[PDB]
Amino acid sequence: QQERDPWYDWDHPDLRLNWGEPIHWDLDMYIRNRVDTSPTPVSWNTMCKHLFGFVAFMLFMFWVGEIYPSYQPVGPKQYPYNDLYLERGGDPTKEPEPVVHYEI
Amino acid sequence: SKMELPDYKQWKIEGTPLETVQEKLAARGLRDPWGRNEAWRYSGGFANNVSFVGALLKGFKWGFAAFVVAVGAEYYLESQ
Amino acid sequence: DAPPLTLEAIKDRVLYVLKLYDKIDPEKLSVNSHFMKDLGLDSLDQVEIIMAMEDEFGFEIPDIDAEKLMCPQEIVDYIADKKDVYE
Amino acid sequence: SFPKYKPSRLATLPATLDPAEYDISPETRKAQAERLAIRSRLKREYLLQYNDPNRLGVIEDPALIRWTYARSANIYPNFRPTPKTSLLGALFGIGPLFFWYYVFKTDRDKKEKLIQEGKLDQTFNISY
Amino acid sequence: AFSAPAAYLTHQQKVLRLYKRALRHLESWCVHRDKYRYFACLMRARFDEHKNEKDMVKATQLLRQAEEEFWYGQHPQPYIFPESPGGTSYERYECYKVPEWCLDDWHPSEKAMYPDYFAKREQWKRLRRESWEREVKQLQEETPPGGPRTEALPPARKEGDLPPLWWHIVTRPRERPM
Amino acid sequence: MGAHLARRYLGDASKEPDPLRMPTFPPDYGFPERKEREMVATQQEMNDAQLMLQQRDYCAHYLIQLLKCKRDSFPNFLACKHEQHDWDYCEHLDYVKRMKEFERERRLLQRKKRREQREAEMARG
Amino acid sequence: MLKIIIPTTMLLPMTWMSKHNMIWINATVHSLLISLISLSLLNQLGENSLNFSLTFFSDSLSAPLLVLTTWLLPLMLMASQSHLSKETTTRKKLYITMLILLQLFLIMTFTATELILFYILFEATLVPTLIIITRWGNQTERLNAGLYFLFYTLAGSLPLLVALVYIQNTTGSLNFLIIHYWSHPLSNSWSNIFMWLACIMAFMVKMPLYGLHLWLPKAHVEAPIAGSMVLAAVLLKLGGYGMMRITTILNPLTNYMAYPFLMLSMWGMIMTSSICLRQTDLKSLIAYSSVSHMALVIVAIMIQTPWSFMGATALMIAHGLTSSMLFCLANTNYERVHSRTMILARGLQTLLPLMATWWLVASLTNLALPPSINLIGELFIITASFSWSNITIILMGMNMMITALYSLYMLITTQRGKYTHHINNIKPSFTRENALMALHILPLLLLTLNPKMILGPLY
Amino acid sequence: CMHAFFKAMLFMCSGSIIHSLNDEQDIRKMGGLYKAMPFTTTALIIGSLALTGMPYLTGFYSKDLIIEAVNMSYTNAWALLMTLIATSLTAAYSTRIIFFAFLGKPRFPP
Amino acid sequence: VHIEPRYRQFPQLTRSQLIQAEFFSATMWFWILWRFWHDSDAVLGHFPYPDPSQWTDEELGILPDDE
Amino acid sequence: SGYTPDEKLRLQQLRELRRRWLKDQELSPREPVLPPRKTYRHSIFAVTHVLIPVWIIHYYLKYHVTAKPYTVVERKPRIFPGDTILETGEVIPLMKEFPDQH
Amino acid sequence: IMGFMLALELNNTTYYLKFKYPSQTYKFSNMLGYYPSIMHRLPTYHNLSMSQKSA
Numbered sequence A: 001q002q003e004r005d006p007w008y009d010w011d012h013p014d015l016r017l018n019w020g021e022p023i024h025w026d027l028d029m030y031i032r033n034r035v036d037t038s039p040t041p042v043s044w045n046t047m048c049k050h051l052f053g054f055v056a057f058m059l060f061m062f063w064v065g066e067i068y069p070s071y072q073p074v075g076p077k078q079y080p081y082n083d084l085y086l087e088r089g090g091d092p093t094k095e096p097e098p099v100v101h102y103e104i
Numbered sequence B: 001s002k003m004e005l006p007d008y009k010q011w012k013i014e015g016t017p018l019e020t021v022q023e024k025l026a027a028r029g030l031r032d033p034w035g036r037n038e039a040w041r042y043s044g045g046f047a048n049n050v051s052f053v054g055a056l057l058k059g060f061k062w063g064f065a066a067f068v069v070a071v072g073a074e075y076y077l078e079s080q
Numbered sequence C: 001d002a003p004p005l006t007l008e009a010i011k012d013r014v015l016y017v018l019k020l021y022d023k024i025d026p027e028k029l030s031v032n033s034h035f036m037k038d039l040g041l042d043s044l045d046q047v048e049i050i051m052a053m054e055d056e057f058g059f060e061i062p063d064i065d066a067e068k069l070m071c072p073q074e075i076v077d078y079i080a081d082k083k084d085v086y087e
Numbered sequence D: 001s002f003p004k005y006k007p008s009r010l011a012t013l014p015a016t017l018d019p020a021e022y023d024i025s026p027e028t029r030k031a032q033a034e035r036l037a038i039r040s041r042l043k044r045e046y047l048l049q050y051n052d053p054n055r056l057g058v059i060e061d062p063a064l065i066r067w068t069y070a071r072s073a074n075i076y077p078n079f080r081p082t083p084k085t086s087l088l089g090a091l092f093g094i095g096p097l098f099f100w101y102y103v104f105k106t107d108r109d110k111k112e113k114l115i116q117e118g119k120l121d122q123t124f125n126i127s128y
Numbered sequence E: 001a002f003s004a005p006a007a008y009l010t011h012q013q014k015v016l017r018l019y020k021r022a023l024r025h026l027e028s029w030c031v032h033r034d035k036y037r038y039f040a041c042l043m044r045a046r047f048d049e050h051k052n053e054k055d056m057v058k059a060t061q062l063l064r065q066a067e068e069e070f071w072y073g074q075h076p077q078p079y080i081f082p083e084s085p086g087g088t089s090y091e092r093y094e095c096y097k098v099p100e101w102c103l104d105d106w107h108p109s110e111k112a113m114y115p116d117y118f119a120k121r122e123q124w125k126r127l128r129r130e131s132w133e134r135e136v137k138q139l140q141e142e143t144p145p146g147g148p149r150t151e152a153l154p155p156a157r158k159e160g161d162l163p164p165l166w167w168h169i170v171t172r173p174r175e176r177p178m
Numbered sequence F: 001m002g003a004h005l006a007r008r009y010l011g012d013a014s015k016e017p018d019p020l021r022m023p024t025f026p027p028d029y030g031f032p033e034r035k036e037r038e039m040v041a042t043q044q045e046m047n048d049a050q051l052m053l054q055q056r057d058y059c060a061h062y063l064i065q066l067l068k069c070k071r072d073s074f075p076n077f078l079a080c081k082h083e084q085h086d087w088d089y090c091e092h093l094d095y096v097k098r099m100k101e102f103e104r105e106r107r108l109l110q111r112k113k114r115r116e117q118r119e120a121e122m123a124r125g
Numbered sequence G: 001m002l003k004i005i006i007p008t009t010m011l012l013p014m015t016w017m018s019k020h021n022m023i024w025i026n027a028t029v030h031s032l033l034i035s036l037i038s039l040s041l042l043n044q045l046g047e048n049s050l051n052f053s054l055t056f057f058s059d060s061l062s063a064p065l066l067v068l069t070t071w072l073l074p075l076m077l078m079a080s081q082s083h084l085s086k087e088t089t090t091r092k093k094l095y096i097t098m099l100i101l102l103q104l105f106l107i108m109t110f111t112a113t114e115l116i117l118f119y120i121l122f123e124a125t126l127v128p129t130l131i132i133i134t135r136w137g138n139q140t141e142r143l144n145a146g147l148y149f150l151f152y153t154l155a156g157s158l159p160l161l162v163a164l165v166y167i168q169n170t171t172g173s174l175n176f177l178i179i180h181y182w183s184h185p186l187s188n189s190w191s192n193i194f195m196w197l198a199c200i201m202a203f204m205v206k207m208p209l210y211g212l213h214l215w216l217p218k219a220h221v222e223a224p225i226a227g228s229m230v231l232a233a234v235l236l237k238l239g240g241y242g243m244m245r246i247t248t249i250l251n252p253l254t255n256y257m258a259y260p261f262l263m264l265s266m267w268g269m270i271m272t273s274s275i276c277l278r279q280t281d282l283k284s285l286i287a288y289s290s291v292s293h294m295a296l297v298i299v300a301i302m303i304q305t306p307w308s309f310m311g312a313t314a315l316m317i318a319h320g321l322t323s324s325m326l327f328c329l330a331n332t333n334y335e336r337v338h339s340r341t342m343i344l345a346r347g348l349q350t351l352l353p354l355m356a357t358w359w360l361v362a363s364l365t366n367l368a369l370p371p372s373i374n375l376i377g378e379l380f381i382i383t384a385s386f387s388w389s390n391i392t393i394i395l396m397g398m399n400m401m402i403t404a405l406y407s408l409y410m411l412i413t414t415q416r417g418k419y420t421h422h423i424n425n426i427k428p429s430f431t432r433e434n435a436l437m438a439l440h441i442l443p444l445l446l447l448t449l450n451p452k453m454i455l456g457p458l459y
Numbered sequence H: 001c002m003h004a005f006f007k008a009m010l011f012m013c014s015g016s017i018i019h020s021l022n023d024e025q026d027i028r029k030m031g032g033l034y035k036a037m038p039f040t041t042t043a044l045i046i047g048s049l050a051l052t053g054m055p056y057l058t059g060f061y062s063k064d065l066i067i068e069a070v071n072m073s074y075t076n077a078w079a080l081l082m083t084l085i086a087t088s089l090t091a092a093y094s095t096r097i098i099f100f101a102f103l104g105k106p107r108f109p110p
Numbered sequence I: 001v002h003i004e005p006r007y008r009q010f011p012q013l014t015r016s017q018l019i020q021a022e023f024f025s026a027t028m029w030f031w032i033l034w035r036f037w038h039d040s041d042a043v044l045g046h047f048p049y050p051d052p053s054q055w056t057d058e059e060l061g062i063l064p065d066d067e
Numbered sequence J: 001s002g003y004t005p006d007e008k009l010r011l012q013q014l015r016e017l018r019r020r021w022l023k024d025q026e027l028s029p030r031e032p033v034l035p036p037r038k039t040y041r042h043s044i045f046a047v048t049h050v051l052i053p054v055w056i057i058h059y060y061l062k063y064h065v066t067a068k069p070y071t072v073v074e075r076k077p078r079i080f081p082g083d084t085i086l087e088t089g090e091v092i093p094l095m096k097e098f099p100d101q102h
Numbered sequence K: 001i002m003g004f005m006l007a008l009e010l011n012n013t014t015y016y017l018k019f020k021y022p023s024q025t026y027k028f029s030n031m032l033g034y035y036p037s038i039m040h041r042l043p044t045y046h047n048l049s050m051s052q053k054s055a
């Protein structure tokens, strides 16, 4: 019905149907609120190829950037008290392996 | 009430990009019959409009003066 | 919000556009001036006139109805009927 | 000169690009006139009923009635168990069931084996 | 929408519709008025150059090639008037359109709230009820034995008659009903 | 962003440091006497101030002072500029220490590469 | 329970001795009074049920169903008033008598304390429903619908009778308390498998289960409004109540025999929702939605966890109310235009605002909008199924998406758009219809306010 | 928070333009509004400056810090590049809106 | 206030809206200038970025290659 | 194409009828016949709409919600060095002496 | 600033009396990447077809 002519004086202007004319078997699917088969400016194959290429290229480049990450020329962040052993939930009874940070 | 249409004979394409279009079409051997109906848009208060850089700096003239006055007042208050 | 249209205003605006057309002599132009019989235009000129009216009034005239508007009075009647103007 | 438009099921060919729209025979004009005549007859009947002042109700649509009857009450009498219908019915009605049975059975067997081996994190799971 | 369609579109109608579509899409591409005027003049120059052609086969081939060119070069997002089909304001007021048959289901108190309107409504209803037989007689007299061949309705021949099948066309809801 | 990424990815990744694995060499390797970093704010003080775990670094005392300044002079939020600057400078010093660590790792790796290449040359001839 | 049973057996002579123009008034007033009386059964204990006598007992599962039935009777009476204007006095009294007998049988079925009496009453409910359908249906297919309904139910339930008498002979008693306290594990043998099959298949055919469900669209489409209201709201819950009652003696064999039925129920949810997506009939859409919800209840009962029974009970009550409301709305639209086609009448929001509001509320409750008891039950069932396995979440999610899709699709199709031009008999909504919709919808929101009353005995 | 502020203002300005031009939502028909609608033009310019991150507007205290944090992080290089390109395209479409809506000559009906 | 529609002419403006638009644009630019005068560090940085190439092996603890 | 005489005449008649219909659709000066049947505004709005809900909610919270344990839980205030604990009259001491960083 | 300058240049190029057909990149960008077309026509058609043909 989207493909049907909008300027004609239909008996059902919203459905774009006439009284008495045969009804398509899939009218429930082809209403204007649902699947549209109207012609597009670009061919369906070209649209599918472009969309697939774009998404595949983006995924590939995301994987490449994941295996080649970006960072800064700095060392690991240093935290006191065995890298905050007790603050992160370490067991008070057990003694953690000491972590010592020196000046530079 | 009862808005009156302006006189139609006042619409000329002279001093307008439409006259350049007419010159190009005359050089090509053609003519543009709808020149004036579009030429209403290039006259009156619509004749001149600002550029993009001039639009962003819409109130810089007064803002700069206010900034200068505020800086001077702040320095004077700090001194005294 | 916007002021309502009237028959006189519609006629004035369509005659304004027609007088701004360069292929029509304003002195011999009236509301009953046939575009082809007594104004000497053709199909492309009539299409351009219809498009100019569409641009002027901010709405589209379907091609099924646009091919039959051969008079300024006919254009006025069509616009008034579509816009529900009765005075 | 220009790239050609390739129609698809969901990207159907426009009426201005249809080759048959420019190769018209006198029989095609007769067919178009017959179609217009049928449409005009149906429109006249509908408009008479619609503009009848004494009518109070719904103008029954035989086309709508036929569509509803064919889609619901006319399927089984016109069904023959062809190989195509048999295979499609068997597939679409049995395959998903066995697929889901296999998936759920595998998942539950893995979970039960983990529970029996005592290597599944069941702490704080007191609502089942 | 007000005119009954024909069985087919003639060559002149096809080329005129193509010309209007090409001009509209060119205006969509050429946003500015001077540029649009220049290129519209060029387009009409092309059409006038091909205007005189006695060979209908060659004219049809030119039309087909022009349609292919238009489809390739059309604007992906052409300008559409707001009220036109596909526009941003299309069918916006269809929910406010209520008919007179709904209007006659009102309560007597509601009808008494508007006394003068319903007198004229009753006059219109009487006028409708006094013409239906003449309308149907005129329709059945002028039809061919096979039946209607087009969706065009005859006018009223007599002075006291009304054009057949006029009620809903005349009493259709206003374009801005509320 | 930087030239280190280009050096590591389009050059000798063995000579360039690995951020996720450094430091590799012992902290005392090349430092005859190295001083352990000093923490001013105590664990109890940080816990009472309710600093976020990412904010409980060696610059926590300046953050505590900034928070105390901001809370006390509430209506005048344009007050603790000195405390904000002190905290920012402490964080800047921490960052430059991290940069020093990275550079030390880089040149220690390149020195190891030079030493092993010299050893290979000696073994060959 | 006699304080509720006797007033129905007094509704019968009152209906048959009342005046010709007072039958509806008397029946409605006294049905409302009986519902108010039956509201007292909600005061359940926490450990054991209410044992009134050797024959009748009430539990936290029985009480909400009894209240639902006693509340549903007057609404059916109002709908019957709607569609039975031109019937004769004797036939109207017979219709009211059928409704009263059905309600009495349902009450006794829900409050029965033994499995054989439960079976007798649960089969006794067939006669009034069959008579109502095949006598006051409007179309030709009512006879076929009645035949399908009756024979599906009986083919399901006869092996249940054989299994029940066998169980009584083997164990000693069919009393529910005894078979719960004296329950013993069921070994994994062919005989036990077939006994399990007998009982479960009976209740699943009643439920219904996907693949055994065609009788449901056939009967619900062709039944009158009262028949559709009682079929969808209460008669579908007999299978769920029976399964929640009969599974006490089927463990641990239920842990092994539940796979085919679980897969059938989940794929049936999916398939019936997809069918709802493309239905040209409104009543068929509502019937298939009912099938999907009952399949979800089946999944909950089969997984059989304490969080699944509460969800099952809540979903049963909520679905009963929602389906009754949807059927009432569809019947109003049908009575306006005399056709069940969904796309025939449009613009009903423009033509009837209050009915558009009722449609919106009913469709929102259908798609389980929080914090409605529909969503409460569905969420409990989904959580229990997730604990059971971690792909049931995928199946439930897609089912929920399709459910929302078809609910809003039917709402938009019926209410929104441009009204049909040639349909000029859309009269304003009646006070009776508006009150019917309000009485359907308000208890749902009140149960949302107080949800612990419909969460079963495992709360 | 900042985006809520300036995005709501931008939508209000667009709605004012649409209402003033008789339900017209096309920049190809908008034009001359810099002098036609002074206050709307000022508000839309300020909103577009805040949207693109003018160094001391509402969008500066969020977008600038976000970009700085993305730069100095152990993140995906492709994600960082796409973020920078997205910022450039944000400036680009703000320029498109301003240019096609307020600058130039009128294109609306007479 | 009442504004008469214009046909093919520049619309009728108002002194109030003109002065308000100019005032708010001036306010925005004044705020930007005032903030940049006081908080130029937020845009141009505050602390110098160290050059790793200028750090000595002695302070970085790098021994001579002979060891 | 163009308007045939029949089409033109029918259009003229329909236009006449439609315009008359719209003129009838106009209303009369008397037409709506109804049945016979700011500091003050802001003050009356502020007392009810603001003052009554706040009273009700404060009463509900202070005597019903806070009558049960753990219903209202407040994150404990931040304690900084060099502070005064008001509950027990305590003094939380200062930190160490900061090494100057310039 | 780079985006500002490039957008302003490409917008100023629209005043020239030169007309060229659109590019593949322009068609991709204006058509929303073809995502609404493909993903709103294909899955919906297949689901609504299997809902009627199969179930």
Ligand SMILES: CCCCCCCCCCCCCCCCCC(=O)OC[C@H](COP(=O)([O-])OCC(O)COP(=O)([O-])OC[C@@H](COC(=O)CCCCCCCCCCCCCCCCC)OC(=O)CCCCCCCCCCCCCCCCC)OC(=O)CCCCCCCCCCCCCCCCC
Residues within 6 Å of the ligand: A053, A054, A057, H081, H084, H085, H088, H089, H092, H096, K002, K003, K006, K007, K010, K011, K014, K020, K021, K022, K023, K024, K025, K026, K029
């Ligand atoms: C599967 C691929 C997956 C790719 C994934 C990755 C995607 C990356 C995207 C990169 C950016 C794309 C830019 C927009 C492209 C679309 C343009 C468009 O449609 O314009 C129409 C639209 C106006 O349309 P209209 O007014 O309605 O009229 C349309 C015409 O009638 C008719 O219009 P037209 O068609 O004649 O005009 C379009 C024309 C003119 O537009 C442009 O040239 C746009 C790009 C400008 C130059 C950008 C690069 C130069 C500047 C940066 C240089 C390096 C700096 C390094 C250092 C940075 C830090 C200091 O462009 C072309 O013809 C080709 C452009 C190719 C762009 C590259 C990406 C797509 C390649 C696809 C393969 C096929 C290419 C050939 C075309 C198709 C086959 C024939 O243009 C605009 O509104 C402005 C567009 C330009 C905005 C530029 C903003 C800045 C961009 C980023 C600069 C760098 C920032 C910092 C990055 C980080 C540094 C660390």
Ligand SMILES: CCCCCCCCCCCCCCCCCC(=O)OC[C@H](COP(=O)([O-])OCC[N+](C)(C)C)OC(=O)CCCCCCCCCCCCCCCCC
Residues within 6 Å of the ligand: F075, F076, F077, F078, J054
């Ligand atoms: C002590 C007397 C002072 C002079 C008279 C003041 C007016 C008379 C009334 C007494 C006011 C007492 C001071 C209050 C704060 C005044 C403003 C101020 O100091 O701002 C500081 C700060 C501004 O300070 P600053 O940080 O900008 O200062 C910078 C200073 N330099 C630049 C020099 C470094 O502003 C605020 O804190 C903003 C306050 C916003 C208030 C919003 C409205 C609240 C409305 C409440 C409604 C409900 C009421 C009832 C509630 C209960 C339920 C019923």
Ligand SMILES: CCCCCCCC/C=C\CCCCCCCC(=O)O[C@H](COC(=O)CCCCCCC/C=C/CCCCCCCC)COP(=O)(O)OCCN
Residues within 6 Å of the ligand: D083, D084, D085, D087, D088, D090, D091, D094, D095, D098
């Ligand atoms: C290797 C990668 C596989 C990927 C699968 C992709 C999907 C393809 C599989 C499903 C496609 C449909 C196949 C089954 C449907 C039958 C096809 C059919 O209808 O053919 C009939 C004729 O029947 C046949 O030709 C049969 C050929 C295929 C038979 C396949 C083997 C049979 C499988 C037996 C098992 C059936 C039960 C399966 C489910 C059991 C439970 C899991 C006539 O076809 P027409 O439409 O009239 O002509 C169109 C010509 N193009």
Ligand SMILES: *P(=O)(O)OCC(C)(C)[C@H](O)C(=O)NCCC(=O)NCCSC(=O)CCCCCCCCCCCCC
Residues within 6 Å of the ligand: C042, C043, C044, E011, E012, E013, E015, E016, E021, E022, E025, E026, E029, E046, E047, E050, E051, E052, E053, E059, E060, E062, E063, E066, E067, E069, E070, E071, E073, E074, E075
């Ligand atoms: P009027 O009634 O005066 O009569 C004029 C017509 C044309 C009807 C003639 O009477 C006629 O039929 N003449 C002979 C037939 C003929 O002229 N055929 C060829 C004309 S079509 C043609 O030549 C079009 C080619 C140029 C236009 C192509 C359009 C492509 C541009 C698309 C651009 C879209 C985006 C910019």
